[PDB]
Structure formats: structure tokens, C-alpha cells
């Protein structure tokens, strides 16, 4: 079992936090919020670094480029914005979604961004030019998550329509539709580190690890609460192999990936834990909560 203990509480977003992500170089935590702001924080000391501003409405997601130099954010203002973190400059505004942009991610090479929107599409963007390369008719409901696989050749998307779909980055073809019994809304999805699996949250208080090629669910994680929000989930791999997720009961849940047993529950937030992230090299978790809390927390374990 891990022994994550609270080290720092980070405050100053003035509305609900929506997402936290560690920079791939491990130096920084980025946060996004309904307050229309991005904030940067020191990953090891929790020290506030800077605020990045420009969206006209709240932000639902933020993501780092592979070299830790750029961010992309997804906003209710129907745009995504690419940011140079060190200068704070908005390099590009990605326009084309027709409704709230909810999720986003760079590909590993970081020349591309993928986004998902309440307009039910997935879009693939050129980072350098800011242009939308493709618009995928991905879902019949809002798109809750988009993620590239390890070599960027595939995209997984999830939607309240109950589907998780796999897309060929190059062609835009749907290569797979994963069916979950009773089609509960899918609130989060992401590839496993090896790209062979997808971790999917559904709004029935359940997380599942799927061999998506075989359409086989390998693991199921429960005990937490998730029926209303798109809570992120992670693979913790720096120490023990765990699954990490926020919960609507204000806790962070940690499970043994193989045994599916809850190994830890982190107490301290006062509202829904919407987002968790795992540091790339140290056993450190960042968590963030909604409007009644507005804090980000950094926790560390010796294993």
C-alpha cells in the first residue's frame, strides 16, 4: 500500500478548479479553473508561480506539451488556446468548435492537439499553424475525454453517449467502438502507458480497465462516487502500480491495479475532487476540488 500524506494546499483560484496536470519534466503543476484562469505552481514545494489569462469563459481542461514549454487549454468560450508558459503568451487560439471545449491533449510529438467538445466532435489541430486538420463526427453527445496513445497513432475519445471510440490519427477513421453493458455515460478515458488498454470512468460509480481491441474488461474499480462529474483518473507508476481518481465524496481514491482493492483514500478536500494527477518521476499526487473548496492539494508517499 502507498502512504500518501498531505504536504501542501494551494489556494487562489476564485472559482472551482477543473483540472491539474504535472509538467512532463516534473517541475510544475498547471491548474485550470472556472475562474477563466490557468495557474502554475511548483510541483515539489507547492509554491504559486504565475497566472496565465486570456480565455473569456471558464476552462475545463489544460494539458502540457511534451517539452513542458507549452500548454493548451479548453474553454467554455468554444476555443482552445496554446500558451507559451515561460512568457505567458497566447500563441494561438484554436477556433472551430461550436460549443464548449471540454477536454484536450497534445500528442507525444506535440505537433498536434486533440480536443473534445459539447458539440459532440473530436478535433485534431496543428500546433504550429493553429489550424484544425480534422473534425471527427465522433459521438452523439458531449465528448468528455480525448487522449493520444504512446506513439500518437491513435486517439481514444469518450462521451455521455456511452461509447469509447478509437481513432486513427492519420486518417480520422474510427477503428473501434467499445460497448459497456447498459451504456452508462462515459466521463473519462485514457490509454494505459503501454497503449494496450484504456481506463474508462462511467457515471455509475465505476472505473474499468479495458483491453479495447478485444472488448474485454480486465479490471473494475469501485468504492468511490461518480455519477455527475467528469473526474479524471490516472495510472500511478512511480512506486506501486495504482489507479487514482477523484470522487464526489471529496476524497481521492487509490486502488491496487491488479487486485482492484482500495489501498488508500486521501481526506482533506471539502468538495468534489474533480481532478488528480500523478507526478512523472516522484510518488506525488496533485488533487483539485470544486467550488466549495477551490484548493489544490499535493500529497506524497514514500512508495
Amino acid at each position: 500500500k502507498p502512504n500518501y500524506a498531505l504536504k501542501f494546499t494551494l489556494a487562489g483560484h476564485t472559482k472551482a478548479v477543473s483540472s491539474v496536470k504535472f509538467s512532463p519534466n516534473g517541475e510544475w503543476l498547471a491548474s485550470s479553473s472556472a475562474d477563466k484562469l490557468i495557474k502554475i505552481w511548483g510541483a515539489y514545494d507547492g509554491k504559486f508561480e504565475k497566472t496565465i489569462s486570456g480565455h473569456k469563459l471558464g476552462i475545463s481542461d489544460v494539458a502540457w506539451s511534451s517539452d513542458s514549454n507549452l500548454l493548451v487549454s479548453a474553454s467554455d468560450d468554444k476555443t482552445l488556446k496554446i500558451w507559451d508558459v515561460s512568457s505567458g503568451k497566447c500563441l494561438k487560439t484554436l477556433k472551430g468548435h461550436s460549443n464548449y471545449v471540454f477536454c484536450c491533449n497534445f500528442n507525444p510529438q506535440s505537433n498536434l492537439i486533440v480536443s473534445g467538445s459539447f458539440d459532440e466532435s473530436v478535433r485534431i489541430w496543428d500546433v504550429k499553424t493553429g489550424k484544425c486538420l480534422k473534425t471527427l463526427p465522433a459521438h452523439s453527445d458531449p465528448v468528455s475525454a480525448v487522449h493520444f496513445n504512446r506513439d500518437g497513432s491513435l486517439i481514444v475519445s469518450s462521451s455521455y453517449d456511452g461509447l469509447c471510440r478509437i481513432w486513427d490519427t492519420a486518417s480520422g477513421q474510427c477503428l473501434k467502438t467499445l460497448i459497456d453493458d447498459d451504456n452508462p455515460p462515459v466521463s473519462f478515458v485514457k490509454f494505459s502507458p503501454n497503449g494496450k488498454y484504456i481506463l474508462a470512468a462511467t457515471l455509475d460509480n465505476t472505473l474499468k480497465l479495458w483491453d479495447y481491441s478485444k472488448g474485454k474488461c480486465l479490471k473494475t474499480y469501485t468504492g468511490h462516487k461518480n455519477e455527475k462529474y467528469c473526474i479524471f483518473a490516472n495510472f500511478s507508476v512511480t512506486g506501486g502500480k495504482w489507479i487514482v481518481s477523484g470522487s464526489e465524496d471529496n476524497l481521492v481514491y487509490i486502488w491496487n491495479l491488479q487486485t482492484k482493492e482500495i489501498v488508500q483514500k486521501l481526506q482533506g478536500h471539502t468538495d468534489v475532487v474533480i481532478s488528480t494527477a500523478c507526478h512523472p518521476t516522484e510518488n506525488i499526487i496533485a488533487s483539485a476540488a470544486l467550488e466549495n473548496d477551490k484548493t489544490i492539494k499535493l500529497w506524497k508517499s514514500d512508495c
Partner: peptide, 8 residues
């Protein structure tokens, strides 16, 4: 919008 609930 991620910060707002989806009525089940």
C-alpha cells in the same frame, strides 16, 4: 463546464 454537474 467540467465544474458543473450533469444531472443523472
Amino acid at each position: 463546464m467540467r465544474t458543473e454537474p450533469r444531472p443523472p
